[PDB]
Tab-separated table of C-alpha atoms and ligand atoms in Angstrom:
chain	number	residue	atom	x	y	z
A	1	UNK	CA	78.815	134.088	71.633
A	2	UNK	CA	81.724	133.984	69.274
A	3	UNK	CA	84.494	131.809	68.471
A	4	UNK	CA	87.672	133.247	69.622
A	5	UNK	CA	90.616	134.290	67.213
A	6	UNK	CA	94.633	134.971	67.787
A	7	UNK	CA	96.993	135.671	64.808
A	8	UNK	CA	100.401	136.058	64.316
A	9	UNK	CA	103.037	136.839	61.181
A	10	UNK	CA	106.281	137.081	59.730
A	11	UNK	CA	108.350	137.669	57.299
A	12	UNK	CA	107.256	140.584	54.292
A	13	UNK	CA	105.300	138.337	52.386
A	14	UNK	CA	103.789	137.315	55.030
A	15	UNK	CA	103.517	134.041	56.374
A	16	UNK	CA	99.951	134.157	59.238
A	17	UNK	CA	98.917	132.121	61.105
A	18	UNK	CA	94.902	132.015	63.009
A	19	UNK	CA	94.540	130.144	65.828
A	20	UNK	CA	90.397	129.691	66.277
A	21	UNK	CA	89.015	128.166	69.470
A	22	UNK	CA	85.943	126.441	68.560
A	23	UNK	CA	83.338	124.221	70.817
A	24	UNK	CA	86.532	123.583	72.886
A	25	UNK	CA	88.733	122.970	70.112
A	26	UNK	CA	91.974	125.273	68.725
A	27	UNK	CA	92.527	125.376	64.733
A	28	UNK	CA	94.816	126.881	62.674
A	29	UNK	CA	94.824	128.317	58.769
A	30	UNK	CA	97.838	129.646	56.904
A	31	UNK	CA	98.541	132.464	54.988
A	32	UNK	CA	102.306	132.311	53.093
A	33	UNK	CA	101.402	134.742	49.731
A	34	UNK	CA	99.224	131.591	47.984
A	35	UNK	CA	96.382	130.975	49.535
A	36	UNK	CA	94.683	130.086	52.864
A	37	UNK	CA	94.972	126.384	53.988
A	38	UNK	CA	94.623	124.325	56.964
A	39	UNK	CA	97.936	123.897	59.041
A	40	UNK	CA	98.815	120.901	61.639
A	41	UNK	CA	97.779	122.824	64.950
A	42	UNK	CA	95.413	120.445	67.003
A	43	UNK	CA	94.613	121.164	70.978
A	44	UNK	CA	92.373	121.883	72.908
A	45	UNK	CA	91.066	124.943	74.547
A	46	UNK	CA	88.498	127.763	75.093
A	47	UNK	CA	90.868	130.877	75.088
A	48	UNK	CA	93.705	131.597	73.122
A	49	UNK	CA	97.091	133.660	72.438
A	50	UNK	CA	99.790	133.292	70.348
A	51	UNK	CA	103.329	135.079	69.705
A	52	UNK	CA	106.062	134.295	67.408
A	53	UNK	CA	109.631	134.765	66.515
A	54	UNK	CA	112.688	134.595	64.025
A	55	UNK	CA	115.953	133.091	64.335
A	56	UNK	CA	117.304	133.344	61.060
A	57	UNK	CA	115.165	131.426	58.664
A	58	UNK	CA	113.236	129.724	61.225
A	59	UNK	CA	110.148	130.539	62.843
A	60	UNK	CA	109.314	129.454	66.206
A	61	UNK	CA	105.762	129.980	67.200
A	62	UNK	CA	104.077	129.864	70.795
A	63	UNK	CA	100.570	128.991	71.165
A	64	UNK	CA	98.908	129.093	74.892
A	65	UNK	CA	95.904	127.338	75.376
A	66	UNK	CA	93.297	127.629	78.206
A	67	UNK	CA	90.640	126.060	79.819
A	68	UNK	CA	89.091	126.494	83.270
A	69	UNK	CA	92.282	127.923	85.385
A	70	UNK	CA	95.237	125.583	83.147
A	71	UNK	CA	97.247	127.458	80.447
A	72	UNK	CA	99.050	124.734	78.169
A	73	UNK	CA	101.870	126.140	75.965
A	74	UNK	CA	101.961	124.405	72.716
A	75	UNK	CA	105.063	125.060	70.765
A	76	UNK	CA	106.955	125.329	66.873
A	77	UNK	CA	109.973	125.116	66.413
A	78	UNK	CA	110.211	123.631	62.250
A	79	UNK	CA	109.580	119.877	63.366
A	80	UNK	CA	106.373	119.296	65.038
A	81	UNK	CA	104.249	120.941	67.693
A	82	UNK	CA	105.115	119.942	71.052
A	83	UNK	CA	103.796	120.929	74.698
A	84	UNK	CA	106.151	123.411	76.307
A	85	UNK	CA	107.383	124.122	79.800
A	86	UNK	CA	104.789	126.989	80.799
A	87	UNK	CA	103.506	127.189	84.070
A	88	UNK	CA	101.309	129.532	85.512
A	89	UNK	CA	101.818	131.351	89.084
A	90	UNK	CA	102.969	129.449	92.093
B	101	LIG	C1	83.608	131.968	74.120
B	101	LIG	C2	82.276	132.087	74.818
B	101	LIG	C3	81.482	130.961	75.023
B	101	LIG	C4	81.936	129.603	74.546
B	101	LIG	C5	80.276	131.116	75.678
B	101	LIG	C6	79.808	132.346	76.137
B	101	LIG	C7	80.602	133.485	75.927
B	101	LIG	C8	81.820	133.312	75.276
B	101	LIG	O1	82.679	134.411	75.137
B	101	LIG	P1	82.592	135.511	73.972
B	101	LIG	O2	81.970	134.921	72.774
B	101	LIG	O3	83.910	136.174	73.896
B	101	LIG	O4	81.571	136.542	74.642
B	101	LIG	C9	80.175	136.537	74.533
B	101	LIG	C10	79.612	137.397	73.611
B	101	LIG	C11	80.473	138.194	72.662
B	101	LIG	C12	78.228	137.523	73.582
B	101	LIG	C13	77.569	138.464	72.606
B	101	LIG	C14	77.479	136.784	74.478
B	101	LIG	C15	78.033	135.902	75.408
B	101	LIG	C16	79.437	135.772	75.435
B	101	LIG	C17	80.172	134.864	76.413
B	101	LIG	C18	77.144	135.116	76.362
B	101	LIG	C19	76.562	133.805	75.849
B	101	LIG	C20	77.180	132.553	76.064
B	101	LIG	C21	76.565	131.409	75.549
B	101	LIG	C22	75.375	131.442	74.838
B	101	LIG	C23	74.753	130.175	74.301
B	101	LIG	C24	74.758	132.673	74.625
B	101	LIG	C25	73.464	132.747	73.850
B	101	LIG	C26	75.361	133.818	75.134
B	101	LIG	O5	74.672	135.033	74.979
B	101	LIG	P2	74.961	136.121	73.837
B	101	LIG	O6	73.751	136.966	73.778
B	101	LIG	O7	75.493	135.468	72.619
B	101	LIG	O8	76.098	137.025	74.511
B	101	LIG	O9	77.112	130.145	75.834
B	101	LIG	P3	78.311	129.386	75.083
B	101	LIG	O10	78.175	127.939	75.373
B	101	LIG	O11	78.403	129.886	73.696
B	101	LIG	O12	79.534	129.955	75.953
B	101	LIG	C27	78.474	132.454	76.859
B	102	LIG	C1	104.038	114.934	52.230
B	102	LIG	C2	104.303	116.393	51.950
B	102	LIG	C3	104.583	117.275	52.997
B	102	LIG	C4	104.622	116.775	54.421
B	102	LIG	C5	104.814	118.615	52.697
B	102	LIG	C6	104.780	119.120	51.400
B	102	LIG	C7	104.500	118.228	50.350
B	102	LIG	C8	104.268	116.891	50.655
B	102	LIG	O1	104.013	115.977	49.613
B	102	LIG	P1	102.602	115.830	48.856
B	102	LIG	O2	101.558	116.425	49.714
B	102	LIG	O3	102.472	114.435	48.374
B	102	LIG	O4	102.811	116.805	47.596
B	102	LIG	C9	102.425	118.162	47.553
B	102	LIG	C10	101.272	118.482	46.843
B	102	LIG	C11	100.440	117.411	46.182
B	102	LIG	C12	100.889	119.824	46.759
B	102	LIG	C13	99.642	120.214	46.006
B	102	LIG	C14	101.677	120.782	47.387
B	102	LIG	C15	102.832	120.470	48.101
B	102	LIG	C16	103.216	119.120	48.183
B	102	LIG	C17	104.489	118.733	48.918
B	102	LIG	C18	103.663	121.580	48.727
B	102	LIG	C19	103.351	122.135	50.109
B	102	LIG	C20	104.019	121.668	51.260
B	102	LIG	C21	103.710	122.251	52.487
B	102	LIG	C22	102.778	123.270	52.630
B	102	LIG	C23	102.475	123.862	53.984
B	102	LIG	C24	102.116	123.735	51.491
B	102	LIG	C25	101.088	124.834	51.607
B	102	LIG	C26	102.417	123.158	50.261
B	102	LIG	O5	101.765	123.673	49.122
B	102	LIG	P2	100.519	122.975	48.386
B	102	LIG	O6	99.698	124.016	47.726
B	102	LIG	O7	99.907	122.026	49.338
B	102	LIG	O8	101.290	122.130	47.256
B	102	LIG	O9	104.394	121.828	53.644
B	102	LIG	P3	104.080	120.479	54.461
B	102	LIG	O10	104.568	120.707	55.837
B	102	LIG	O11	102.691	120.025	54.217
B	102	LIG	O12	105.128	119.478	53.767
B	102	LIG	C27	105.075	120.584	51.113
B	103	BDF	O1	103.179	125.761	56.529
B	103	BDF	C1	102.209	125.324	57.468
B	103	BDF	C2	102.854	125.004	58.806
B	103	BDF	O2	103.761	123.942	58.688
B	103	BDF	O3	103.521	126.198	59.206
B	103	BDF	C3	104.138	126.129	60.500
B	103	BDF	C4	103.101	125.858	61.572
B	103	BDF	O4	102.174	126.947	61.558
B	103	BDF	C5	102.398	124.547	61.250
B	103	BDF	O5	101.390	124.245	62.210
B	103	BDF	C6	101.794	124.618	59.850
B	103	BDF	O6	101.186	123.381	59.505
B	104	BDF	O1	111.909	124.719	73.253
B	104	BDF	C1	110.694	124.832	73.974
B	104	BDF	C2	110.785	125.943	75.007
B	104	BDF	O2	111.933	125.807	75.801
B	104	BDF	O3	110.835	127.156	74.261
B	104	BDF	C3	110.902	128.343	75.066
B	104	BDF	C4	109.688	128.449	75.966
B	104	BDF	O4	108.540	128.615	75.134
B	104	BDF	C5	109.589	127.193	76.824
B	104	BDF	O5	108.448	127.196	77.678
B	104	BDF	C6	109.562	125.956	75.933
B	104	BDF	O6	109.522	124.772	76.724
C-alpha cells in the first residue's frame, strides 16, 4: 500500500503545497521558488483532499481529512490552521 498524496498551488512562481497521509498521520512540504521545506500542517487522517484560493494577496487553503466515515476540514487563512465548519450529509 501507499501513502496517500493531495497538492495544491498558486500564484506563477508557484507556491505548493503536499499534504501526505502517513500511518494515520497528514504532513505537509512547501514549494515557494527556494526549496522544499516542512510547513505547520499537523492532523490526523487516512485520506486526503485539499483546494485553495486567492483573495488578493492572501491564500486561504482547505484541507479535509478522513478517517473511518468523519471528514474534518482543517483550514488557512494567513494566521494559523484551524478546524472548520464542514459537515458531511445529514
Ligand atoms: C492507504 C492504504 C492502507 C493504509 C492500507 C491498505 C490500502 C491502502 O490504500 P492504497 O495504498 O491507496 O491502496 C492499496 C494499494 C495501492 C495496494 C497495491 C495494495 C493495497 C492497498 C490498500 C492493499 C494492502 C493493504 C495493506 C497491506 C499491509 C498490504 C500488503 C496491502 O497489499 P498490497 O499488495 O500492497 O496492495 O494494509 P495497510 O495497513 O497498509 O492498509 C491495505
Ligand atoms: C520565527 C520566524 C518565523 C515564524 C517565520 C520566519 C522567520 C522566523 O524567524 P527565524 O526562524 O528565527 O529566522 C529565519 C531564519 C533563521 C531563516 C533561515 C529563514 C527565515 C527566518 C525568519 C525566513 C522564512 C520564514 C518563513 C518561511 C515559511 C520560510 C521558508 C522562511 O525561509 P527560510 O529559508 O526558513 O529562512 O515563514 P514562517 O511562517 O516560518 O515565519 C520567516
Ligand atoms: O510558508 C509555509 C506556510 O506558512 O504556508 C502556508 C501554509 O501552507 C502553512 O501550513 C505553511 O507552514
Ligand atoms: O473561515 C472558515 C470557514 O468559514 O471558511 C469557509 C469554509 O471552509 C467553512 O467551512 C469554514 O468554517
Amino acid at each position: 500500500s501507499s501513502v496517500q498524496t493531495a497538492a495544491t498551488s498558486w500564484g506563477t512562481v508557484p507556491s505548493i503545497r503536499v499534504y501526505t497521509a502517513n500511518n494515520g498521520k497528514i504532513t505537509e512540504r512547501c514549494w515557494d521558488g527556494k526549496g522544499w521545506y516542512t510547513g505547520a500542517f499537523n492532523e490526523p487522517g487516512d485520506n486526503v483532499s485539499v483546494t485553495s484560493w486567492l483573495v488578493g494577496s492572501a491564500i486561504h487553503i482547505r484541507v479535509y481529512a478522513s478517517t473511518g466515515t468523519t471528514t474534518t476540514e482543517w483550514c488557512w487563512d494567513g494566521n494559523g490552521w484551524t478546524k472548520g465548519a464542514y459537515t458531511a450529509t445529514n
